[PDB]
Amino acid sequence: CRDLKELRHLAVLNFPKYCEPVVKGEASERDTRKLWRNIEPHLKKAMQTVYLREISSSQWEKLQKDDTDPGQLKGLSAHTHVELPYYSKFILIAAYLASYNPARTDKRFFLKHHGKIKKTNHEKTSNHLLGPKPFPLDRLLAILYSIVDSRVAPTANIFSQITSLVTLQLLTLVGHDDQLDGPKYKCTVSLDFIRAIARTVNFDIIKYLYDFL
């Protein structure tokens, strides 16, 4: 940090969590060589949140309401552990591979009876680094039937996670609004929290990426 206004509002918030030995009376005045040992563990989980005024008296309060199964993370990176429906948690996982893979080299995860050429098995290419590739709806109608176990009937509540996730800011639109003859969509969030959800419903996405051979 460099601005003086940031340290003005941050040093005040650290006073209630630093003046503990002073009120109890275990530390007398003039002692700057013994107060850094007890405060060292109290600063390792707070110095990594710079330029963020969200860290206050409500971060550690969320841990008090989690007496049963403290596996949920609320406050510090709360987006990693969120609540997803059963048939909706696989939507963000399946749509992540449709925005970084070619529209032709997709038969390697379905029909393994084809003939692979071995192109190189180049590595520093723009693939998976330029951004989400524009994909229509024909790709989603052929990949969700392989990730799930049993069959799924595409009813009215199956396609509801396509438009409802637009308001939730999880997928972007190809500029202007399309018609109805199969619109195109992209991506938004990377794989920062996809691995956390996959380890709860028994799933592995690392072995499904095309860039990591």
Partner: peptide, 26 residues
């Protein structure tokens, strides 16, 4: 166990979970 190592890792959940009664003897 030697035939499943010659295919894709994604289709392992359909062969191991279905034939779990045969891969657990003794």
């Amino acid at each position: 166990e030697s035939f499943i190592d010659t295919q894709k890792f994604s289709v392992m959940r359909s062969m191991r979970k279905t034939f779990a009664r045969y891969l657990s003897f003794r």
